[PDB]
Amino acid sequence: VELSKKVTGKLDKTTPGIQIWRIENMEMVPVPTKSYGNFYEGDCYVLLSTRKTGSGFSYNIHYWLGKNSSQDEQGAAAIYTTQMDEYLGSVAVQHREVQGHESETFRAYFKQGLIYKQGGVASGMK
Secondary structure, three states, X not given: OOOOOOOOOOOOOOOOEEEEEEOHHHOOOEEOOOOOOOOOOOOOEEEEEEEEOOOOEEEXXXXXXXXXXXXXXXXXXXXXXXXXXXXXXXXXXXXXXXXXXXXXXXXXXXXXXXXXXXXXXXXXXX
């Protein structure tokens, strides 16, 4: 929720890799490298890639839209990516992905295998 503060504060600094955000239960969440890879398929996942450069770092915010949530959810994953795009310094970029758009791009950042669990992780009841 509101990536700002617990995210825009220090999305990624001096560290080549990527930090995704799980949109399970229709809500953004900080997905570090401890869970990166196995992300629900029916949801949304913002992936912020950061690389080193001669001037500083190059960020690349992505917005994965595992076609399952609702149109508003698409506005959410995109909003968080829009909050870190400016809070990062405008040096980041914006990318579009989906359940069939993050093919070699998503796996590209993941040189191994991307798993996909079941969305709706806020059930724990039904």
